[PDB]
Each structure stands twice: as structure tokens, then as C-alpha cells.
Amino acid sequence: TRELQSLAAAVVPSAQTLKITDFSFSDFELSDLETALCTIRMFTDLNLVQNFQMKHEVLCRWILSVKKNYRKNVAYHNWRHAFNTAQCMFAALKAGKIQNKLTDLEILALLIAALSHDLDHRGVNNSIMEHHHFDQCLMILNSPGNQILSGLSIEEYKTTLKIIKQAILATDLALYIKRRGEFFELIRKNQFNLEDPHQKELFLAMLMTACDLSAITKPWPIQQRIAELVATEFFDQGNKIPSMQVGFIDAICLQLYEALTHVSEDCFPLLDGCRKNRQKWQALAEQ
Ligand SMILES: COc1ccc([C@H]2C[C@H]3c4c(nc5ccc(C#N)cc5c4N2)CCN3C(C)=O)cc1Cl
Ligand SMILES: [Mg+2]
Ligand SMILES: [Zn+2]
């Protein structure tokens, strides 16, 4: 309440000041309070506070509830990773122009899922995990004073919960591998149509994984620092790195970001930064 009083009374700087529209956004210089302000700006500039009548104090308490339920002692899967996944979601809807291809409920659920998709993570060394993350997302969404979705009707609320649940479930890389071949086959044949609800639901799953791994697309000095955090989680429980990074980019990332650019050409900076990082890690791999 000492933190919530200061956050609620603050002024929320514009999206341009906060630099949350650039795919190259980084958070290393930001306080926990600054990340909260950037998050309010995301809800605000996506018209989520307005279209769904969110009381300011409730959104402030909800953001702080979400942030508190991430574990700081976890090197990578912490609040900062969830904040970044939401930022890339914002950058994709705005700079990537994905906004027009989605509905308000879908955008409202994507932002909530991106912020929640790793709640109570304990580090890689501890599809059940994603079901636990949605469980914690649901518990916070139902906490007194945190119900940011109270402005929705019951039909709106039930649809949004279904989308939130699927989006968090989609961040299971096993589900991504199960489903990506379909998404690539329909991108191949020039058949991809978002009007198909099964195709729209599949795309929302791919958009989640794209933002979930957005770190692999960051500029080299940032990507180097994030790859450190990843190593500290996998390794030190809190040489071989360059090769494992190129293998991850090859197996997982490059096709995903390639397909995303076909859906919207303005998501190209993700595919670009992911390639420049493959070059950098490949050179390091060769010593
Ligand atoms: C001991 O050190 C490492 C070991 C492996 C990796 C590789 C693979 C790794 C991985 C995973 N998710 C990542 C998400 C983002 C980024 C970035 N940027 C990189 C990610 C990432 N890199 C999950 C799958 N995985 C597995 C199975 O090991 C990196 C480091 Cl440093
Ligand atoms: Mg996860
Ligand atoms: Zn994640």
C-alpha cells in the first residue's frame, strides 16, 4: 500500500516518452515503478482502460499484484520477462500494425496473458506449468480490488477468459511445435485467413510465442545481457552458450518470426534482429 499509493498518484508518461513502441525497447535502466507506468500506458493506449471502464486504482493494484507474484530470485522467468513479453505485444499491435487485425477482447486478453503467462515461475529447474500460470492469473483477476475485468459483461468475461487461458497455454513450446506446422502450411499456400476462427485462434497462439521469445530479437548488447540471465537460470540455478543459441534460433525462432512478417510486414524488425543475433552467436561459436 506504500507502493500502490505512489503508483496511483503518479502521472503516466506518454507511449513515445516510455519508448514502449520500439521493438528494440529495453528495461535495464528502469525501476519497478517505471515498468508499472509503462504497463498502464499499454492498457491506456490500447484503449483498454476506456473501452472496458477500468478504475485507475484497480489497474494499479492488479499490476502490482501480478508483479509481486513473480519471483525476483529467479534470474530470467521473473516480472521483467513478463513485462517485456507484454511490451513486445504492445510493439506488435502498434508498430507491427497487428491492432487492426484483432478485436478489443482479443487485445485485452493478449495483454493480460502476456503479463501473466509465467506467474509464480521458479526457474527451469523445478503442459502442467502453463496451467499453473493461468491458475495464478485467474486468482489475481478475482482478488478484491484487482478485478480489472469487472467492466465486462458475463459473456464478454467468459470469452476473454477463454482467450487468456489459450494464450497462456500457447506459451508452452511443446504446443508451439505441435501447432506451428499448420500455421506454416497455411502461410505457404497463400490461404491464411484470420476470418476463420480456428485460424485466428491459432494465430493468437503464435503471436504469444513470438512475444514470449522476443529477447532473441533484441539488439546485440541487450541480447548478450538477456542470454546471461538465461544461462544463470539454466546453469547456476538462480562456451556452450553461443552454439545452443544458434540452435534455438534455427529450430524455434527464425521460422516463427519469418511467418509473422508475412502476416504483417511491419513486424520485420523482430525477424531482422533475430538474424543479426544469429550472425553474432555463430561468429562466437566459431571462436
Ligand atoms: C545454459 O545456458 C543456455 C542454455 C540454452 C539456451 C538456449 C536454449 C533454451 C532456451 C529457451 N528459451 C529461451 C528464451 C529466450 C532466449 C533468448 N534470448 C533464449 C532461450 C533459450 N536458449 C528454452 C529452451 N532451451 C533449452 C531447452 O535449453 C541458452 C542458454 Cl544461455
Ligand atoms: Mg513459460
Ligand atoms: Zn515466458
Curated annotation (Swiss-Prot):
Active-site residue numbers: 77
Residues in PDEase domain copies: 1-287
User: Outcome of residue 281 to Y?
Assistant: Changes substrate selectivity from cGMP-specific to dual cAMP and cGMP binding and hydrolysis
Q: Which residues bind Mg(2+)?
A: 118
Q: Mutating residue 215 to N: effect?
A: Changes substrate selectivity from cGMP-specific to dual cAMP and cGMP binding and hydrolysis
Q: Which residues does 3',5'-cyclic GMP bind?
A: 245
Where Zn(2+) is bound, by residue?
A: 81, 117-118, 212
Q: How is it modified after translation?
A: Phosphorylation is regulated by binding of cGMP to the two allosteric sites. Phosphorylation by PRKG1 leads to its activation.
Question: Found in which tissues?
Answer: Expressed in aortic smooth muscle cells, heart, placenta, skeletal muscle and pancreas and, to a much lesser extent, in brain, liver and lung.
Going by the entry's taxonomy, the superkingdom of the source organism is recorded as Eukaryota
Role played: Plays a role in signal transduction by regulating the intracellular concentration of cyclic nucleotides. This phosphodiesterase catalyzes the specific hydrolysis of cGMP to 5'-GMP. Specifically regulates nitric-oxide-generated cGMP.
Note what the entry says on domains: Composed of a C-terminal catalytic domain containing two putative divalent metal sites and an N-terminal regulatory domain which contains two homologous allosteric cGMP-binding regions, A and B.
Similarity comment: Belongs to the cyclic nucleotide phosphodiesterase family.
Write the protein's name.
cGMP-specific 3',5'-cyclic phosphodiesterase
Lineage of producing organism? Eukaryota, Metazoa, Chordata, Craniata, Vertebrata
